[PDB]
Amino acid sequence: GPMPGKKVVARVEEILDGVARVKFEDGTKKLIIAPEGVKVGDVVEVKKV
Amino acid sequence: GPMPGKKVVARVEEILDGVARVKFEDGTKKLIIAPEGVKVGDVVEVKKV
């Protein structure tokens, strides 16, 4: 079961026009939309609104 | 170019064991890791750490 209070983060491997290819904790790489100011090598979080 | 100060959010369509299928603003649906407490119908954000 997902751990309560655990933040979810991914590493930015490639980015173009606000769309980042990120590596998740399990090592899987996927495209996501990322905010402006995010560069390759930066870390992003997935958080509940 | 990505708009500066614009938050990135996605809608949670399906979730299981901390892995959500979310719909991005463009309508594309993808699996992501999501924090504990995220249920179907919730909204998540992608934010720089």
Numbering used by the authors:
A (entry chain A), B (entry chain A): 1 to 49
What did the study's authors say about this model?
Here, we study fold transition between distinct β-barrels by protein engineering and structural biology technique. Here, we discover that the previously reconstructed ancient DPBB sequence could also adopt a β-barrel fold named Double-Zeta β-barrel (DZBB), as a metamorphic protein. The DZBB fold is not found in any modern protein, although its structure shares similarities with RIFT and OB. Furthermore, the reconstructed OB fold could also be converted to the four-stranded SH3 fold by a simple circular permutation. Thus, these ancient β-barrel folds (DPBB, RIFT, OB, and SH3) could be readily interconverted by a few feasible mutations through the missing-link fold, DZBB, indicating their significantly close evolutionary relationships.
Furthermore, we verified that the 13 a.a. sequence forming the flexible β-turn in segment 1 in the OB-fold designs could be shortened to 7 a.a. Taken together, very short In/Del and a few point mutations are the determinants in the transition between the DZBB and OB folds.
